[PDB]
Design a protein around this ligand. Structure first.
Ligand SMILES: O=C(CO)[C@@H](O)[C@@H](O)[C@H](O)CO
Ligand SMILES: O=C(CO)[C@@H](O)[C@@H](O)[C@H](O)CO
Ligand SMILES: O=C(CO)[C@@H](O)[C@@H](O)[C@H](O)CO
Ligand SMILES: O=C(CO)[C@@H](O)[C@@H](O)[C@H](O)CO
Ligand SMILES: [Mn+2]
Ligand SMILES: [Mn+2]
Ligand SMILES: [Mn+2]
Ligand SMILES: [Mn+2]
Lengths: 291, 289, 288, 288
């Protein structure tokens, strides 16, 4: 019923990589999707884009995209020039997604990430500016055939949208068909009173789901209430994609942004990493589907 | 075991009239009032004694919590900061002794909240902290105080994130007045198993903070209280249990804890009093035996 | 939401001085005392009034539970037994009206405990029950009583084991005074989902029994109380919630409930009172 | 850690063509096939060597389960029944030695299913059973067989309902080849804590049965599999894990297990295989 994927970053420490290599890999592991980071895409020549797309197609894999925007790409910024640069970044990015045959982008698209908490916070303001900026970027995504998914994050990674109710509120205000709410088991695990409740609250608006255990290991052997999640996705008729985003390695920008300060992977080599991702894929298909 | 509640549940700054809160929590039924250490250094020996008297008078025991500033960072590579940090704790510990306060907990091995803007040297900071803490432990052992190292989630600290890392750090310190401190809010993020984490701390568990996943008072959230209660019994925990709910926006507290929505849902002091009391009955009931 | 407790939590027989428990329960803070129906047929109109006055006085609502005997089996193939069964409930409902009791619950569509040696004809008994209950239901309407059919685990009943079955049975009866009743001890065994079972019962839910997996008072076991509070809220449940803990060996109750070890761990009456009161505070707090 | 499944998952009677299930199970990927012991006493020496050969040929290990009949009740007050009982198990154990199986489990210290009409004499039945099992243990040791006592829920047994009661019994038996056996379906009913029950069994746990709350295959139900995996690692479990799902109505199995609704949802043999295999993968992954 649902399509299952994994973020390429599970194997890499930077926000870019040889996506073709991961497409070939997740396809043999049996995944339906490979989620990739948007950051290197604006530096892809036309033929590079075509090759990536031809790779996904040839391997029967669908590409989705995640993005943690930089401060210069902050659609909610009070500075009108940053907003302008941001809109131009997204417009160019969305057109590149069109050339890639990609139809979903997700992450803290209504803000930037990681948040510099060193600075003063104007939530009400940022919220207002964000809703307006997202409104117009949404027109471009729609024209590009891309769903713009706004991911609800925990309090330490953002201050605008921390619960599914805030995400639904923000999205209703945006009021554009191709703009959705996106939940993540790791972020819900912290902020939500109820996991099934948060999903039922998102309901018809839910456009993407990220998965990971409480401490971001692969889905299945931790404390996340997977069965409850499966019932709730069934209650809301969720048709979509489910992308596991495990982060178990220290090091690099990835290690530092996700804040992995111990070797959660326990010395796993690449092959070990593959086997767990595959077991977690099988587990996700078995537990999360068909009610 | 004894149950308490951190005073900040009612305030938006890391200070307040602790005497007012002692009488409040005593009315509510608590055995403990946990107070922020921050204003304690600016106390006169007169203020210390009355607070101590106010507590004893109401039958309330006092515990202290502390989010060290950058300049109180015992892990700092800067020797002047380490110096000033030990000086701060030595005085504080002495003052705590003049209040018959026998327990202090928090990111005592580091600083909070930490600035992730700068570069982090985990292995270095860890070695410096072990040493500094063992030293402060001496002053602690003298003032009759258990120096409790709270295990925090990755967003708030990078040295100790799991009970296992906590036990290892404390064992490296190798001193009787240094303990591991667990918090249900942080365990909920970092641990594979809640009961397993508590069993791991075992004899080193010197203090426990409670709160729901999103920091509401214990009870109607997703925290596995029964499992916790059972594990505390597995390790024969005798220590205290202090709820540390944070449900209000605003101020340094709302900012440090990162409450960006009104979780209390417009609760007034009376409403907050009731929920705390309900959470108290709930905790004594579920967590014991 | 009104909270009660079943008097047998203290007693080892399906009968006791309900006046004594009405008072004990009133000081513990419950809103309801649930009693067994079996002694009621032996009460004079005077005793009935003495009971209804002791309750109205202590500000306690009374609910009734009943585990039918074989002779009271509304689903029996034996047309005589069905006739006797219908008269029994007809008389009982009339008595309940006098006591101003508006709810009766239990395996009212069958009997309890079930004798499993007797061969089982589920399809047969199911059709007979539906017919029999629809009749009794008119009587129930007249007396102003909600006839609640408790869904039980497979070891205590074979007709209705899950909320879905209960709902099908009730819909087939098709009569407003017939409700589905759930019990956490029973759901714990048979259901795929607790919150889901509740949501399935939805509008048909007329009564809820509570207890831990092993029948201890609500709160320190594995039943998912928060999930229940949430689902009751989702279906807009305002009915009552009655705990029915059984922690003592011995007697017809100990034998019928199958308590084969001292689950109360030597609790004396004041100890049992204390735990029921704590469980009551827990239930008001968590479930609402 | 070795995983198996009970052949009765596909059948409605306490016997069947075990060679057929050995091949099916090898193909699905299981390490073990657990079979009912009842047909085994009537196996010629030839049939025994054929079954053993099939098992070795397919890389499958065999374990055995058994619901004793009243005449095989080692706890019986009637000394003749105890005599028959002992002789039944001594012959059975030697056959297991021939078939090359090192494990037998079930309510071996009693009989199953239990006739509850008979008044219960727990204490008496308990002492006798301890004594009888101890004698049998010697034969079990001689045959290199682990005699595992399954802890059951109150509706199916009155002697051992919790892990603590099972350990007490086994410690009282005081013999190395007698072990405690837990079952997720039974634990779900009686225990305060699943993980706690497993850690209480600890070194004494010699076998584990799995099933969801309502006996569906492991995985999409409410059993806390992760907590079980963690407790098994806590104690360092070196035994096997056999799922024992019962999702079909009919026959002695359907009535003994009390399946009164089609839990399988019309699953044909093929769908049952797929689900069994999917649960095997889940079990290997989660229980670690
Ligand atoms: O849930 C998270 C943020 O922690 C994900 O969105 C990130 O892993 C992505 O890289 C941000 O798009
Ligand atoms: O649990 C926490 C961290 O979130 C405690 O450290 C703080 O709440 C104290 O106020 C300072 O340690
Ligand atoms: O759930 C149950 C016990 O199985 C209770 O409703 C019964 O014991 C009633 O007392 C009679 O049906
Ligand atoms: O758990 C159980 C009985 O409920 C199993 O051991 C039985 O089904 C076996 O067939 C006989 O012990
Ligand atoms: Mn995410
Ligand atoms: Mn804390
Ligand atoms: Mn009941
Ligand atoms: Mn079993």
């Amino acid at each position: 019923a649902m399509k299952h994927g994994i973020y390429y970053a599970y194997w890499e420490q930077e926000w870019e990589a040889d996506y073709k290599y991961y497409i070939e890999k997740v396809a043999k592991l049996g995944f339906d999707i490979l989620e990739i980071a948007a950051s290197p895409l604006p530096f892809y020549s036309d033929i590079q884009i075509n090759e990536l797309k031809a790779c996904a197609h040839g391997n029967g894999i669908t590409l989705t995209v995640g993005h943690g925007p930089s401060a210069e790409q902050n659609l909610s910024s009070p500075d009108p020039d940053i907003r302008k640069n941001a809109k131009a970044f997204y417009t160019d990015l969305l057109k590149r997604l069109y050339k890639l045959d990609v139809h979903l982008i997700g992450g803290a698209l209504y803000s930037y990430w990681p948040i510099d908490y060193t600075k003063t916070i104007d939530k009400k303001g940022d919220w207002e500016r964000s809703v307006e900026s997202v409104r117009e970027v949404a027109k471009v995504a729609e024209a590009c055939g891309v769903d713009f998914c706004l991911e609800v994050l925990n309090r330490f990674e953002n201050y605008l949208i921390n619960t599914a109710q805030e995400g639904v509120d923000f999205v209703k205000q945006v009021d554009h068909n191709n703009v959705k709410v996106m939940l993540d088991t790791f972020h819900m695990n912290i902020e939500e009173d109820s996991i099934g409740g948060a999903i039922r609250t998102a309901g018809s608006y839910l456009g993407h789901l990220h998965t990971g255990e409480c401490n971001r290991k692969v889905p299945g052997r931790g404390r996340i209430p997977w069965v409850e999640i499966g019932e709730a996705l069934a209650d809301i008729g969720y048709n979509g994609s489910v992308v596991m985003e495990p982060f178990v390695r220290m090091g690099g920008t990835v290690g530092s942004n996700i804040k992995v300060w111990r070797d959660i992977s326990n010395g796993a080599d690449e092959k070990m990493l593959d086997r767990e991702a595959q077991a977690a894929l099988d587990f996700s298909r078995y537990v999360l589907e068909c009610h």
